[model samples]
Structure formats: structure tokens, C-alpha cells
Target chain A: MQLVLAAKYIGAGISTIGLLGAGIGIAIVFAALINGVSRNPSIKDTVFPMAILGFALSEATGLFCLMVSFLLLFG
Target chain B: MQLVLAAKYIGAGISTIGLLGAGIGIAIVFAALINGVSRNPSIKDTVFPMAILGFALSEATGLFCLMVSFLLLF
Candidate 1:
């Protein structure tokens, strides 16, 4: 029924919207890296890896939401 | 009275949802940076620019959400 369609698409919206959470995490990692480098750009190389780790750490939720949305649509 | 109001709330909800990224990002950035500086206390020039860059990057998505919401709404 049309209601099913509405729910599924709305579910997609909800999931995609979760990118907001992940978005915050990823941005924070990068921001911290920026913060680290600002005081001494030379140390950036050392901190960049940590930043990347943080980015991934933060993005897990966002990616999970996207994946769930995909599954909701397909399965 | 109408679904129109519901849709409006939904729009507002979605639009505001992404604002946390910048705030969280800035908080962590400064915290870590301070800890880092306390130990080493060196890089001041470029560090500030890069920090501001992250500050900018941190906040832009929320603004983008606002923009996208505008398109979604009007």
C-alpha cells in the first residue's frame, strides 16, 4: 500500500539524516587535528593519523544509518 | 488542522539535526590541542590557521543543512 511506500521512504530520510551524528564526529576529529597543527604545524604529520582515526571513529554511526536505510529499502 | 504543519515540523527537525557536528568538533579540537600544547608548547603560527580551518569545516555542514533544507522547503 501507499503507506508502506511512505514509511520506507521516510525511513530512508531518517537514516540519511543520521549522517548528522557521524558528520559531527568526523568533523571533530579533523577539527582537533587542525587545532593541533595550529600551535605547531610541524607536528601535523604526527597528529594527522590520529585525526584520520577519529574521522573513522566518528563516521561509524553515520555509515551505519546509511547501511540500515539501504537494507530497509531492499530487504 | 493539516498535514502541512506536520511536514513543516519534519523539515525543521531534519534541518536542525546536523548542527552538533561543529560544536562537538570544536570542543574536541580545543581540548586535544590544549593537552598537546601543554606537553610540547611549540607550534603557534600554522597551528592557529589549521585550527580555524577545522573550526570552519566543523561548522559548515550545519549551514549546508540549512541551505539544503531551504531547497527542500521552497
Candidate 2:
């Protein structure tokens, strides 16, 4: 009983590490966004939408991690 | 043996970290694709195929992680 509980806690914490990649990934998306904007101001209209889409997609992975973490702790 | 088996569950959870990179990598490729397309609409013909290829490769890595995680959990 307690053994599984302990495992759940450990799993919850470890699962959160997945957020690290998400953080970096989102940063890269925006970084590319800014780079594109400055390099060619004309493309902002097109690139901005793509950046938002990328941000949502990249963030979705992190949400999965968060979901797993929550499941470990609460489920 | 119980302790060792318990650790496997945590290991399975930890392995999902791999998906993070895959998620971002796909985003990066698509972002580049959009950037390229916007700069030169003509190149979409060339760049879109490469973007799809990169996305598939990146997603494959994540699938490997998921498979390993499943193996550990089950």
C-alpha cells in the first residue's frame, strides 16, 4: 500500500521533468519568430500565425506531462 | 523484488520526457517551413516536403519513447 504510494510520488516528480523540453521548445519557437520578424518584417503576417500554431503544438506536449504528473499524484 | 518492480513504473513516467523534444522539434521544422514559405512562396514546393519528413522523423523518436514506457509499465 505505502510502497505504491511512494512510487506514485516519485513518478509525479520525475514526470514533471518533461516540462523542461517543452519550455525549451516553446522558447525556440518564439525565438525563431522574433528572428523572422526582424530579418524580414514583411513576413510577420504569415509567420506570426505559424508561430502561434507552433507554440500551441509544442505546449501540448508539456500539458501531457502535466496530465501524467497529475494522474500520478491524484489518480 | 517489489521495490525493483515499483521503480519500473517511475521509469516509465520518466521516459515520457522524450516526447518533449519531439514536440518541439516538429514545431521548429514547421516554423521554418512557414518562414520559408512566406519569404518565397515559390519554395513551398520544396520546403514543405522537407518539413513533413522532419516531422515524421521527430515523431518517430517520441513513439520509441512511448513504446519503451509502455514496455516498462506493462
Best-performing candidate as measured by TM-score: 2
- Tell me the tens digit of each residue's lDDT in model 2 across A1-75: 677778878888887887776788778878878877877787788778777777777777777777777867787
- Over the stretch A1-75, how does candidate 1's per-residue lDDT look in tens digits? 555654554454455566666656765676567555655667867998787677666666666765665665456
The interface RMSD values of the models, given in order, are: 4.2, 2.0
Q: Considering summed lDDT, which 10 consecutive residues are worst modelled in model 1 chain B?
A: B1-10
- TM-score of chain A, model number 1: 0.83
Candidate 1 deviant stretches above 4 angstroms: A1-16, A31-75
lDDT string, candidate 1, B1-74, tens digits: 23543444464456556666656766666666566566556665545555665556555545555543453355
Query: In terms of TM-score, how similar is model 2 to the real structure?
Result: 0.82
- Model 2: runs farther than 4 Å from truth? none
Candidate 2, B1-74: lDDT as tens digits: 77776787688788888888887787778778776766686776787679778878877887787677667766
